[PDB]
């Protein structure tokens, strides 16, 4: 039996050397071309344990995306541990591309194909793949964007549902498009639009899955963030190199008992960093229309915990959960 093991996976992508967009530039030096001859082999009569919450693939991806951002998006001023650094801070072209992670000789990536798979415990439909599927390294809070959908029903996953401190990762089975724009010609005012009925239906179906986990006698409530850094109180993300902070109150105020939801957003120059504890200042926004149309494919939630009612709030912050939301079906083993 092949044992789980750590190695440096290599990355593969469709990056182009003639594209100045920063993910492309990073991948042109860090990665190889996307596998021209992918091969998935089913492992007959094999049952394998997985644990999405303890997976070194996540840690490697995290370090890679930190490196990508550090090389690519330079702040004008950075404050870490009382120390200030200043440097040139040019605007860049920024649009994530899919990255695949690949096993080098002596190692294999195992993939769980079980339909209901919660990320931990035994998998009965296991295959080997030369590389993962292509994952866009989207850095965001609250909502997971441009990811992969659950094939059948919505799936919710947690390291321990009974522990209210553990994040719940929701995987949708139907994308909800969200369009965010800072219009052409207040240069920091922006907004996001999404279908009201689609979002309401989404919340209803998530609530059903939550009741299935916590008790059908339970009443499910969504409420906004309880507070903290603006990055986690809002739905925050990077669009076109600019940092958007979108008020998500309307998304997360719901109970069981207009065509579009319009979320107000602000582009901020001073951000709390996700890569390390500290703050960074970037330059004011570029001119012109700044717009991103994204698929909402998942959510990060916390549950209040602590009678008869369960309250859930938008969460996130630790980007390792973003990577886990795509890497949950994979593990690396040593061939012996």
């Amino acid at each position: 039996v092949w044992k789980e093991a750590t190695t440096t996976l290599f990355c593969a992508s469709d990056a182009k050397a003639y594209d100045t967009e920063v993910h492309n530039v990073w991948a042109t030096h860090a990665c190889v071309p996307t596998d021209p001859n992918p091969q998935e082999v089913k492992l007959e009569n094999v049952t394998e344990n997985f644990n999405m919450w303890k997976n070194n693939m996540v840690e490697q991806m995290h370090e890679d995306i930190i490196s990508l951002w550090d090389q690519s998006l330079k702040p004008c001023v950075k404050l870490t541990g009382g120390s200030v650094i200043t440097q040139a801070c040019p605007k860049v072209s920024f649009e994530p591309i899919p990255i695949h992670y690949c096993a080098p000789a002596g190692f294999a990536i195992l993939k769980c194909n079980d339909k209901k798979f919660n990320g931990t415990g035994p998998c009965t439909n296991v295959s080997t793949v030369q590389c993962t599927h292509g994952i866009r390294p989207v850095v965001s809070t609250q909502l997971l964007l441009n990811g992969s959908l659950a094939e059948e029903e919505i799936v919710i996953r947690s390291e321990n549902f009974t522990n209210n401190a553990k994040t719940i990762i929701v995987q949708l089975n139907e994308s909800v498009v969200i369009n965010c724009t800072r219009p052409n010609n207040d240069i920091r005012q922006a907004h996001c639009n999404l279908s009201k009925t689609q979002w309401e239906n989404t919340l209803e179906q998530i609530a059903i899955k939550l009741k299935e986990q916590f008790g059908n006698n339970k009443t499910i409530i969504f409420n906004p963030s309880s507070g903290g850094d603006p990055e986690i109180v809002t739905h925050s993300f990077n669009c076109g190199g600019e940092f958007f902070y979108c008020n998500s109150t309307q998304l997360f105020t719901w109970n069981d008992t207009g065509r579009n939801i319009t979320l107000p957003c602000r582009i901020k120059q001073i951000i709390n960093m996700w890569q390390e504890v500290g703050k960074a200042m970037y330059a004011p926004p570029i001119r012109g229309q700044i717009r991103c149309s994204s698929n909402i494919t998942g959510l990060l939630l916390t549950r209040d915990g602590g009678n008869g009612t369960e309250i859930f709030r938008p969460g996130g912050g630790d980007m390792r959960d973003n990577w886990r939301s795509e890497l949950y079906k994979y593990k690396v083993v040593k061939i012996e």
Partner: peptide, 27 residues
Amino acid sequence: XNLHFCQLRCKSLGLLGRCAXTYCACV
């Protein structure tokens, strides 16, 4: 994350603080 200052901030909303990665979250 700065946990102490995170804690120092959240209590003023009536709340405990904890890290969410490199971010401060109130509970």
